[PDB]
Coordinates of C-alpha atoms in Angstrom, one line a residue:
Chain A
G1 CA 0.0 0.0 0.0
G2 CA 2.0 2.9 -1.3
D3 CA 2.1 5.6 -4.0
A4 CA 5.3 5.7 -6.1
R5 CA 4.5 8.5 -8.6
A6 CA 4.9 11.3 -6.1
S7 CA 8.3 10.8 -4.5
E8 CA 10.0 10.3 -7.8
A9 CA 8.4 13.4 -9.3
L10 CA 9.4 15.4 -6.2
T11 CA 13.0 14.2 -6.5
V12 CA 13.1 15.0 -10.2
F13 CA 11.6 18.5 -9.6
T14 CA 14.1 19.2 -6.8
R15 CA 17.0 18.3 -9.0
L16 CA 15.6 20.4 -11.9
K17 CA 15.2 23.4 -9.5
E18 CA 18.8 23.0 -8.2
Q19 CA 20.1 22.8 -11.8
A20 CA 18.1 25.9 -12.8
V21 CA 19.3 27.9 -9.8
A22 CA 22.9 26.9 -10.6
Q23 CA 22.7 28.2 -14.1
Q24 CA 21.4 31.6 -12.9
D25 CA 17.9 31.0 -14.5
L26 CA 15.7 31.5 -11.4
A27 CA 16.0 32.8 -7.9
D28 CA 15.9 30.8 -4.6
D29 CA 12.7 32.4 -3.3
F30 CA 10.0 29.7 -3.9
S31 CA 9.3 26.3 -2.4
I32 CA 8.1 22.9 -3.7
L33 CA 5.9 20.7 -1.4
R34 CA 4.2 17.3 -1.7
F35 CA 0.5 16.7 -1.1
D36 CA 0.3 13.0 -0.2
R37 CA -3.2 11.5 -0.8
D38 CA -2.7 8.8 1.9
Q39 CA -2.3 11.1 4.9
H40 CA -4.8 13.8 3.6
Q41 CA -7.5 11.5 2.2
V42 CA -7.9 13.0 -1.2
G43 CA -8.6 11.6 -4.7
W44 CA -5.2 12.5 -6.2
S45 CA -1.8 13.5 -4.9
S46 CA -0.5 16.8 -6.1
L47 CA 2.7 19.0 -6.2
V48 CA 2.4 22.6 -5.1
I49 CA 4.8 25.4 -5.9
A50 CA 4.4 28.2 -3.3
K51 CA 6.0 31.7 -3.5
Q52 CA 5.2 34.2 -0.8
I53 CA 5.7 38.0 -0.4
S54 CA 4.6 40.7 2.0
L55 CA 1.9 43.4 1.3
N56 CA 1.5 46.1 3.9
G57 CA 2.6 43.7 6.6
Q58 CA 0.1 40.9 5.5
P59 CA 1.8 37.8 4.2
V60 CA 0.4 36.5 0.8
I61 CA 1.0 33.1 -0.6
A62 CA 0.5 32.1 -4.2
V63 CA 0.2 28.4 -5.1
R64 CA 0.1 26.5 -8.4
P65 CA -0.9 22.9 -7.7
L66 CA -0.1 20.1 -10.2
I67 CA -2.3 17.1 -10.1
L68 CA -0.6 13.7 -10.4
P69 CA -3.1 11.1 -11.7
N70 CA -2.0 7.5 -11.5
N71 CA -3.0 4.5 -13.6
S72 CA -2.2 1.9 -11.0
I73 CA -5.3 2.7 -8.9
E74 CA -8.9 3.0 -9.8
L75 CA -11.3 5.7 -8.4
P76 CA -14.8 4.6 -7.6
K77 CA -17.3 5.4 -10.4
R78 CA -20.4 7.5 -10.3
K79 CA -23.8 5.7 -10.7
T80 CA -26.9 7.2 -12.3
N81 CA -30.4 5.9 -13.0
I82 CA -32.6 6.4 -16.0
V83 CA -36.1 4.9 -16.6
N84 CA -37.5 3.4 -19.8
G85 CA -41.1 2.3 -19.6
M86 CA -41.4 -0.2 -16.7
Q87 CA -37.7 -0.9 -16.3
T88 CA -34.9 1.1 -14.6
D89 CA -31.2 0.6 -15.2
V90 CA -27.9 2.0 -13.9
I91 CA -25.2 3.7 -16.0
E92 CA -21.7 3.6 -14.7
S93 CA -19.9 6.9 -15.6
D94 CA -16.2 7.9 -15.1
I95 CA -14.6 10.6 -13.0
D96 CA -12.2 13.1 -14.6
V97 CA -9.4 15.3 -13.0
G98 CA -11.6 18.4 -13.0
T99 CA -14.2 16.9 -10.7
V100 CA -11.5 16.0 -8.2
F101 CA -10.3 19.6 -7.8
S102 CA -13.3 20.8 -5.8
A103 CA -13.7 23.5 -3.1
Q104 CA -12.9 21.0 -0.3
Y105 CA -9.7 19.9 -2.1
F106 CA -8.5 23.5 -2.4
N107 CA -9.4 24.2 1.2
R108 CA -7.4 21.3 2.5
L109 CA -4.5 22.2 0.2
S110 CA -4.5 25.8 1.5
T111 CA -4.7 24.7 5.1
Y112 CA -1.8 22.3 4.6
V113 CA 0.3 25.0 2.9
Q114 CA -0.4 27.5 5.6
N115 CA 0.6 25.0 8.3
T116 CA 3.7 24.0 6.4
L117 CA 5.0 27.5 5.7
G118 CA 4.6 28.6 9.4
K119 CA 2.0 31.2 8.6
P120 CA -1.5 30.2 9.9
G121 CA -3.4 33.3 9.0
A122 CA -1.7 34.1 5.7
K123 CA -3.8 34.8 2.6
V124 CA -3.6 32.2 -0.1
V125 CA -4.5 32.9 -3.8
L126 CA -4.8 30.4 -6.5
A127 CA -2.7 30.6 -9.7
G128 CA -4.3 28.0 -11.9
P129 CA -4.2 24.2 -11.7
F130 CA -2.5 22.1 -14.3
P131 CA -2.6 18.3 -14.3
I132 CA 0.3 16.2 -15.4
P133 CA -1.1 13.6 -17.9
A134 CA -0.6 9.9 -17.2
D135 CA 1.3 7.5 -19.5
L136 CA 4.2 10.0 -19.4
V137 CA 7.6 8.7 -18.5
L138 CA 9.3 11.2 -16.1
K139 CA 12.7 9.7 -16.7
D140 CA 13.1 11.1 -20.2
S141 CA 10.8 14.2 -20.2
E142 CA 13.2 16.6 -18.5
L143 CA 12.7 19.5 -21.0
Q144 CA 8.9 19.6 -20.6
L145 CA 9.2 19.5 -16.8
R146 CA 11.8 22.3 -16.8
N147 CA 9.6 24.5 -19.0
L148 CA 6.5 23.7 -16.9
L149 CA 8.4 24.7 -13.7
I150 CA 9.6 28.0 -15.3
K151 CA 6.0 28.7 -16.5
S152 CA 4.6 28.0 -13.0
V153 CA 7.1 30.4 -11.4
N154 CA 6.1 33.0 -14.0
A155 CA 2.4 32.5 -13.3
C156 CA 3.0 32.8 -9.5
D157 CA 4.9 36.1 -10.2
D158 CA 2.1 37.3 -12.5
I159 CA -0.7 36.6 -9.9
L160 CA 1.3 38.2 -7.1
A161 CA 2.0 41.3 -9.2
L162 CA -1.7 41.5 -10.2
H163 CA -2.7 41.4 -6.6
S164 CA -0.2 44.0 -5.6
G165 CA -1.3 46.3 -8.4
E166 CA 0.8 47.5 -11.4
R167 CA 0.4 49.5 -14.5
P168 CA -2.2 47.9 -16.9
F169 CA -1.0 47.0 -20.4
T170 CA -2.6 49.4 -23.0
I171 CA -2.4 49.7 -26.7
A172 CA -1.5 53.4 -26.4
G173 CA 2.0 52.3 -25.5
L174 CA 2.4 50.2 -28.6
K175 CA 2.9 53.1 -31.0
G176 CA 6.7 53.0 -30.5
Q177 CA 7.0 56.5 -32.0
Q178 CA 9.5 55.1 -34.5
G179 CA 7.5 54.8 -37.8
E180 CA 6.7 51.1 -37.5
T181 CA 3.4 49.3 -38.2
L182 CA 1.7 46.1 -36.9
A183 CA 0.9 43.4 -39.5
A184 CA -1.2 40.3 -39.1
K185 CA -0.4 37.1 -41.0
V186 CA -2.8 34.2 -41.5
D187 CA -1.7 30.6 -41.8
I188 CA -3.1 27.3 -42.7
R189 CA -1.7 24.2 -41.0
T190 CA -2.1 20.5 -41.2
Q191 CA 0.0 19.2 -38.2
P192 CA -1.4 19.7 -34.7
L193 CA 0.1 22.2 -32.3
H194 CA 1.7 20.9 -29.1
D195 CA 1.2 21.9 -25.5
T196 CA 4.0 22.4 -23.0
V197 CA 3.8 18.7 -22.0
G198 CA 3.4 17.3 -25.5
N199 CA -0.4 17.2 -25.6
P200 CA -1.5 17.7 -29.2
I201 CA -4.0 20.4 -30.1
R202 CA -5.9 20.6 -33.3
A203 CA -5.1 23.8 -35.3
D204 CA -6.1 24.4 -38.9
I205 CA -6.1 28.2 -39.0
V206 CA -3.4 30.2 -37.2
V207 CA -3.6 34.0 -36.9
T208 CA -0.5 35.9 -35.7
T209 CA 0.4 39.5 -35.1
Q210 CA 3.9 40.8 -35.8
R211 CA 5.8 44.1 -35.6
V212 CA 7.1 45.4 -39.0
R213 CA 9.9 47.9 -38.4
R214 CA 11.3 48.4 -41.9
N215 CA 12.4 52.0 -41.7
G216 CA 15.1 52.4 -44.3
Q217 CA 18.3 50.6 -45.4
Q218 CA 17.8 48.3 -42.5
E219 CA 20.8 46.0 -41.8
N220 CA 20.8 42.5 -40.3
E221 CA 19.2 40.9 -43.3
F222 CA 17.4 37.5 -42.6
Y223 CA 17.7 38.4 -38.9
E224 CA 14.6 39.2 -36.8
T225 CA 14.4 40.4 -33.2
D226 CA 11.5 38.5 -31.8
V227 CA 9.0 40.3 -34.0
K228 CA 5.9 38.4 -32.9
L229 CA 3.2 39.2 -30.3
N230 CA 0.2 36.9 -30.4
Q231 CA -1.1 33.6 -31.8
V232 CA -4.6 32.1 -32.0
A233 CA -5.4 28.6 -33.1
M234 CA -8.7 28.1 -34.8
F235 CA -10.6 25.3 -36.7
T236 CA -13.9 25.4 -38.5
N237 CA -16.9 23.0 -38.1
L238 CA -20.2 22.7 -40.0
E239 CA -23.6 22.6 -38.3
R240 CA -26.9 21.7 -39.9
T241 CA -30.1 23.7 -39.3
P242 CA -33.3 21.8 -38.8
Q243 CA -35.2 22.7 -42.0
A244 CA -37.3 20.3 -44.0
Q245 CA -36.7 19.5 -47.6
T246 CA -32.7 29.7 -51.0
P247 CA -30.9 29.7 -47.6
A248 CA -27.9 27.4 -47.6
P249 CA -28.5 24.1 -45.7
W250 CA -25.4 24.3 -43.6
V251 CA -23.9 27.0 -41.4
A252 CA -20.2 27.3 -40.6
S253 CA -19.1 27.6 -36.9
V254 CA -15.5 28.5 -36.1
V255 CA -14.1 27.1 -32.8
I256 CA -11.2 28.7 -31.0
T257 CA -9.0 26.2 -29.3
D258 CA -5.9 27.9 -28.0
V259 CA -4.9 31.5 -27.3
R260 CA -1.3 32.3 -26.3
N261 CA 1.4 35.0 -26.5
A262 CA 4.8 34.9 -28.1
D263 CA 7.5 32.6 -26.7
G264 CA 9.8 35.5 -25.9
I265 CA 7.3 37.3 -23.8
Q266 CA 7.4 36.0 -20.2
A267 CA 4.5 38.2 -18.9
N268 CA 0.8 37.2 -18.9
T269 CA -1.7 39.9 -18.0
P270 CA -5.5 40.0 -18.3
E271 CA -5.4 42.9 -20.8
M272 CA -3.2 40.8 -23.2
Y273 CA -5.9 38.1 -23.4
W274 CA -8.5 40.4 -25.0
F275 CA -5.9 41.9 -27.3
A276 CA -4.9 38.4 -28.5
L277 CA -8.5 37.3 -28.8
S278 CA -9.4 40.3 -31.0
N279 CA -7.3 38.6 -33.8
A280 CA -10.0 35.9 -34.2
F281 CA -12.4 38.2 -35.9
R282 CA -9.7 39.2 -38.5
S283 CA -10.0 35.7 -40.1
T284 CA -13.0 36.8 -42.1
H285 CA -11.1 39.5 -44.1
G286 CA -10.9 37.2 -47.2
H287 CA -13.0 34.3 -46.2
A288 CA -9.9 32.6 -44.8
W289 CA -12.0 30.3 -42.7
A290 CA -13.0 28.4 -45.9
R291 CA -9.4 27.9 -47.0
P292 CA -8.9 24.5 -45.3
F293 CA -11.9 23.1 -47.1
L294 CA -10.4 23.4 -50.6
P295 CA -8.8 20.1 -51.8
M296 CA -5.1 19.7 -51.7
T297 CA -3.2 18.5 -54.8
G298 CA -1.4 15.1 -54.7
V299 CA -2.8 13.6 -51.5
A300 CA -6.3 12.9 -50.1
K301 CA -6.6 11.8 -46.5
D302 CA -10.3 11.3 -47.1
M303 CA -11.1 12.5 -43.6
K304 CA -11.7 16.2 -44.3
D305 CA -13.1 15.7 -47.9
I306 CA -15.7 18.4 -48.8
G307 CA -17.4 16.1 -51.4
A308 CA -19.3 14.4 -48.7
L309 CA -21.6 17.5 -48.5
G310 CA -23.4 16.1 -51.5
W311 CA -24.7 13.1 -49.6
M312 CA -27.8 14.9 -48.4
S313 CA -28.1 17.2 -51.5
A314 CA -30.6 16.9 -54.3
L315 CA -28.5 14.1 -55.8
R316 CA -27.9 11.2 -53.5
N317 CA -24.4 10.5 -54.5
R318 CA -21.3 12.4 -53.4
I319 CA -19.6 15.2 -55.4
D320 CA -16.3 13.8 -56.8
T321 CA -13.3 16.1 -56.2
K322 CA -9.8 15.1 -57.3
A323 CA -10.8 15.4 -61.0
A324 CA -9.4 17.2 -64.0
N325 CA -12.4 19.4 -64.4
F326 CA -12.7 20.3 -60.7
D327 CA -10.9 23.5 -59.7
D328 CA -11.5 26.7 -57.8
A329 CA -14.0 27.8 -60.5
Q330 CA -16.9 25.9 -59.0
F331 CA -15.5 25.3 -55.5
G332 CA -16.8 28.9 -54.8
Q333 CA -20.1 27.9 -56.4
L334 CA -20.4 24.9 -54.1
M335 CA -19.6 27.0 -51.1
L336 CA -22.1 29.6 -52.1
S337 CA -24.8 27.1 -52.8
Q338 CA -24.4 25.0 -49.6
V339 CA -22.7 27.2 -46.9
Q340 CA -23.9 30.4 -45.3
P341 CA -21.6 33.4 -46.1
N342 CA -21.2 34.4 -42.4
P343 CA -19.5 32.3 -39.8
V344 CA -20.1 31.7 -36.1
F345 CA -17.5 32.1 -33.4
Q346 CA -17.2 29.6 -30.5
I347 CA -14.6 28.8 -27.8
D348 CA -13.7 25.6 -26.1
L349 CA -13.2 26.6 -22.5
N350 CA -11.1 24.3 -20.3
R351 CA -10.8 24.8 -16.5
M352 CA -7.6 22.8 -16.3
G353 CA -5.6 24.2 -19.3
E354 CA -2.8 26.8 -19.2
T355 CA -5.4 29.7 -19.4
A356 CA -7.5 28.2 -16.6
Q357 CA -7.9 31.6 -14.8
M358 CA -9.7 33.1 -17.9
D359 CA -11.7 30.0 -18.9
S360 CA -13.2 29.8 -15.4
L361 CA -14.0 33.5 -15.4
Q362 CA -15.7 33.2 -18.8
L363 CA -17.6 30.1 -17.6
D364 CA -18.8 32.1 -14.6
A365 CA -19.8 35.0 -16.9
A366 CA -21.8 32.6 -19.1
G367 CA -24.2 31.8 -16.3
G368 CA -24.4 31.1 -12.6
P369 CA -24.6 32.8 -9.2
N370 CA -21.6 34.9 -10.1
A371 CA -22.9 36.4 -13.3
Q372 CA -22.9 40.2 -12.6
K373 CA -19.5 40.3 -11.0
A374 CA -17.7 38.4 -13.8
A375 CA -19.3 40.6 -16.5
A376 CA -18.4 43.8 -14.5
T377 CA -14.8 42.5 -14.2
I378 CA -14.6 41.8 -17.9
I379 CA -15.9 45.2 -18.8
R380 CA -13.5 46.8 -16.4
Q381 CA -10.5 45.0 -18.0
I382 CA -11.6 45.9 -21.5
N383 CA -11.9 49.5 -20.4
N384 CA -8.4 49.4 -18.9
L385 CA -7.1 48.0 -22.2
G386 CA -7.2 51.0 -24.6
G387 CA -8.3 54.0 -22.6
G388 CA -12.0 53.8 -21.8
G389 CA -15.5 54.6 -23.0
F390 CA -16.5 51.0 -23.9
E391 CA -20.1 51.9 -23.0
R392 CA -20.6 53.6 -26.4
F393 CA -20.2 50.3 -28.2
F394 CA -21.5 47.7 -25.7
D395 CA -24.0 47.6 -22.8
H396 CA -23.4 44.7 -20.5
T397 CA -26.4 45.5 -18.4
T398 CA -28.9 44.3 -21.0
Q399 CA -26.7 42.2 -23.4
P400 CA -25.2 38.8 -22.7
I401 CA -21.5 38.4 -23.4
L402 CA -21.1 34.7 -23.5
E403 CA -23.7 31.9 -24.0
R404 CA -23.5 28.3 -22.9
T405 CA -24.7 25.7 -25.5
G406 CA -24.8 22.8 -23.1
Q407 CA -22.1 20.8 -24.8
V408 CA -19.2 18.8 -23.2
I409 CA -16.2 17.9 -25.3
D410 CA -13.8 15.1 -24.3
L411 CA -10.1 15.8 -24.5
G412 CA -7.8 13.1 -25.7
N413 CA -5.3 11.8 -28.2
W414 CA -5.2 8.9 -30.6
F415 CA -2.0 7.6 -32.1
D416 CA -2.2 7.7 -35.9
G417 CA 0.1 5.4 -37.9
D418 CA 2.7 8.1 -38.4
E419 CA 2.4 10.2 -35.2
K420 CA 0.1 11.0 -32.3
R421 CA -2.8 13.2 -33.2
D422 CA -5.7 14.9 -31.5
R423 CA -9.1 13.4 -30.7
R424 CA -11.0 16.5 -31.9
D425 CA -10.1 15.6 -35.6
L426 CA -13.4 13.7 -35.6
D427 CA -16.1 16.2 -36.5
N428 CA -19.4 16.3 -38.4
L429 CA -17.7 16.1 -41.7
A430 CA -15.4 13.3 -40.6
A431 CA -18.5 11.3 -39.3
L432 CA -20.3 12.0 -42.6
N433 CA -17.3 10.7 -44.5
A434 CA -17.1 7.6 -42.2
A435 CA -20.8 6.7 -42.8
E436 CA -21.1 6.8 -46.6
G437 CA -24.8 6.4 -47.3
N438 CA -26.3 5.5 -43.9
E439 CA -28.2 8.7 -43.0
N440 CA -29.5 7.1 -39.8
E441 CA -26.0 6.5 -38.5
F442 CA -25.0 10.1 -39.1
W443 CA -28.2 11.4 -37.5
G444 CA -27.5 9.2 -34.5
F445 CA -24.0 10.5 -34.2
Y446 CA -25.2 14.1 -34.5
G447 CA -27.8 13.5 -31.8
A448 CA -25.3 12.0 -29.5
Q449 CA -23.7 15.4 -29.2
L450 CA -26.5 18.0 -28.7
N451 CA -29.7 16.0 -27.9
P452 CA -31.5 17.9 -25.0
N453 CA -33.7 14.9 -24.2
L454 CA -30.9 12.4 -23.6
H455 CA -29.1 12.5 -20.3
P456 CA -25.5 13.8 -20.5
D457 CA -24.0 10.5 -19.3
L458 CA -25.8 8.6 -22.0
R459 CA -24.6 11.1 -24.6
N460 CA -21.0 10.7 -23.3
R461 CA -21.4 6.9 -23.6
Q462 CA -22.5 7.2 -27.2
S463 CA -19.7 9.6 -28.0
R464 CA -17.2 7.3 -26.4
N465 CA -18.5 4.3 -28.5
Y466 CA -18.5 6.3 -31.7
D467 CA -14.8 7.3 -31.2
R468 CA -13.9 3.6 -30.8
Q469 CA -16.0 2.7 -33.8
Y470 CA -14.4 5.3 -36.2
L471 CA -11.0 6.4 -34.9
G472 CA -9.6 3.3 -33.4
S473 CA -8.8 1.4 -30.2
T474 CA -5.9 3.7 -29.2
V475 CA -8.0 6.6 -27.9
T476 CA -6.8 7.8 -24.5
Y477 CA -8.9 10.5 -22.8
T478 CA -7.2 13.2 -20.7
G479 CA -9.8 15.8 -19.6
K480 CA -13.0 17.6 -20.2
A481 CA -13.9 20.9 -22.0
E482 CA -17.1 23.0 -22.5
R483 CA -18.2 24.8 -25.6
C484 CA -19.7 28.3 -25.5
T485 CA -20.9 30.8 -28.2
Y486 CA -19.9 34.4 -28.2
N487 CA -22.4 37.1 -28.7
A488 CA -22.5 38.3 -32.3
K489 CA -22.6 42.0 -31.4
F490 CA -19.9 41.7 -28.7
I491 CA -17.1 40.7 -31.1
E492 CA -18.0 43.5 -33.5
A493 CA -18.1 46.0 -30.7
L494 CA -14.7 44.9 -29.3
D495 CA -13.2 45.1 -32.8
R496 CA -14.6 48.6 -33.5
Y497 CA -13.5 49.8 -30.0
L498 CA -9.9 48.6 -30.6
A499 CA -9.9 50.0 -34.1
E500 CA -11.1 53.4 -32.9
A501 CA -8.6 53.4 -30.0
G502 CA -5.6 54.1 -32.3
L503 CA -4.8 50.6 -33.4
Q504 CA -3.8 50.2 -37.0
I505 CA -3.2 46.7 -38.5
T506 CA -2.4 46.1 -42.1
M507 CA -2.3 42.9 -44.2
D508 CA -3.4 41.4 -47.5
Chain B
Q1 CA -38.1 12.0 -29.9
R2 CA -35.4 12.3 -32.6
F3 CA -32.8 15.0 -33.1
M4 CA -33.4 17.3 -36.2
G5 CA -30.8 20.1 -35.9
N6 CA -29.7 23.2 -34.1
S7 CA -32.4 25.8 -34.0
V8 CA -30.3 28.3 -32.0
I9 CA -27.0 28.3 -33.9
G10 CA -28.4 30.6 -36.6
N11 CA -29.3 33.5 -34.2
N12 CA -25.6 34.5 -33.7
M13 CA -23.9 35.3 -37.0
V14 CA -21.5 38.1 -37.8
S15 CA -23.1 40.6 -40.1
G16 CA -20.1 42.9 -40.9
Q17 CA -16.7 42.4 -42.4
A18 CA -13.3 42.5 -40.7
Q19 CA -11.9 46.0 -40.6
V20 CA -8.3 46.3 -41.6
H21 CA -6.2 49.3 -42.7
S22 CA -4.7 47.4 -45.6
Chain C
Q1 CA -25.9 22.1 -12.2
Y2 CA -23.6 25.1 -13.0
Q3 CA -20.7 23.8 -10.8
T4 CA -18.1 26.4 -10.0
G5 CA -14.5 26.6 -8.7
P6 CA -12.1 28.9 -6.9
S7 CA -11.5 32.2 -8.6
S8 CA -8.6 34.6 -7.8
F9 CA -10.6 37.6 -9.1
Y10 CA -13.3 37.2 -6.4
Chain D
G1 CA 11.7 43.6 -26.5
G2 CA 10.7 46.4 -24.2
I3 CA 7.6 44.5 -23.0
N4 CA 9.8 42.2 -20.8
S5 CA 11.7 45.2 -19.4
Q6 CA 8.4 46.8 -18.5
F7 CA 7.1 43.9 -16.4
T8 CA 10.2 41.9 -15.4
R9 CA 8.7 38.7 -14.1
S10 CA 11.3 36.5 -12.4
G11 CA 12.5 33.5 -14.3
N12 CA 14.3 33.7 -17.6
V13 CA 12.7 31.8 -20.5
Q14 CA 14.5 31.0 -23.8
Chain E
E1 CA -17.3 13.0 3.8
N2 CA -13.9 12.2 2.2
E3 CA -15.4 11.6 -1.2
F4 CA -13.4 9.8 -3.9
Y5 CA -11.4 7.9 -1.3
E6 CA -11.9 4.3 -0.1

């Protein structure tokens, strides 16, 4: 009766911290502690990185817990009952990392930290949990652990500085007064992006913001000084409106997966999040959201084929791409005749990701007991970013900011033949391609996602069965995420407010 | 009861076009 | 439902 | 560039 | 109390 994935991790982290301090990379001002599950009676053991300062004589402690799930032990499952006619049955669900980190868990962690550090009445502030995925060998993953430790220290410094109170980041200071301009570059990708711990993330459209400083006969050709600010990963999905059979049958919804800053920038502040998120709306400058749909020349993975859209069209068969006659001449005609011109913007909020502190805030703003406070905080932050007077473009009193669609998305990875990929590659188009002519199977798959009648546990069961049926037997789930839809007017108001606030971005 | 589609996705759609200096 | 978690803002 | 010097969070990266 | 622990 013992746990062996905590002591080894603690030893590795202590050695890494010693090495980093030796190389003059960090400062010996933080502590690393172990949260054993055996002597605290908690679901999962965790590692906490605590850094403390003093504010007006009151000690303040910032903590960044790291959950350590283990595959050698099984947590008890959750039972639910549903009724069908005269018979009742029991469904056995599964428990994720997110449900483990509850209020009681954080309370016990804070009490333990306060007792350990010698300060019983010290204030404790969270900095954002980040679980360490299982099936990861700690012996040969030193680089990821080092980067994660550095990022955790940076996050603790960020939250401490935010609590202390510093100058907000504003776009008025981005002028540079040196005759430079900001340019935004769009990009279409096919290989998934990677997290700080190697977790793949699906990313088809990437929007970045750079600084263009070409003044004159500039020297240092082919050399750039970290001219990059933001990066947003987006991918498009198709949704079908319930109309019986001039409006196009399908409507395109764009999902935002990851928002992050440049690698060089070591600071993360709330006003940077909105500035980075404002780049999402710029993807509609030249219908760039439709670029991944066009066929590529030479290869055909047959997973993202757009010809499947003809399965439910007036003609039963599928439209055949990869043909000599087919080109961009009638690809536009197809998109005009079967896709709505305007897209929809959605975000996949995750309470355990790197940007947990904003995903939780947006989830609270979407709906709950803390609905007014979150909206007021968001409005205050947006006012702080770029001067003020946001009331002229938006009115949070009588206008929702974020809306919850009641959809839960699993987070996992499946090992393709070549390399590990992301579980979110399976979408409506992928399912339509998988089920060639069987309309009933596609309708069942679509209902397994957003059926309001079905219990969420049953929908999750059907979604887990479909993934095994289509993708393969190598699927490995890692977490949970929730999908939300932004207000249509909010995005436009934010974009117009930033544009009027002296921000000028040029591109193709 | 059988699913038929999303009757609420069509309410939120961007009407304007991205504003860039170009 | 609408389960919530700790928030540093409030 | 100047952003890092304006905030100066402890812990060098890259 | 002590949920998720046996």
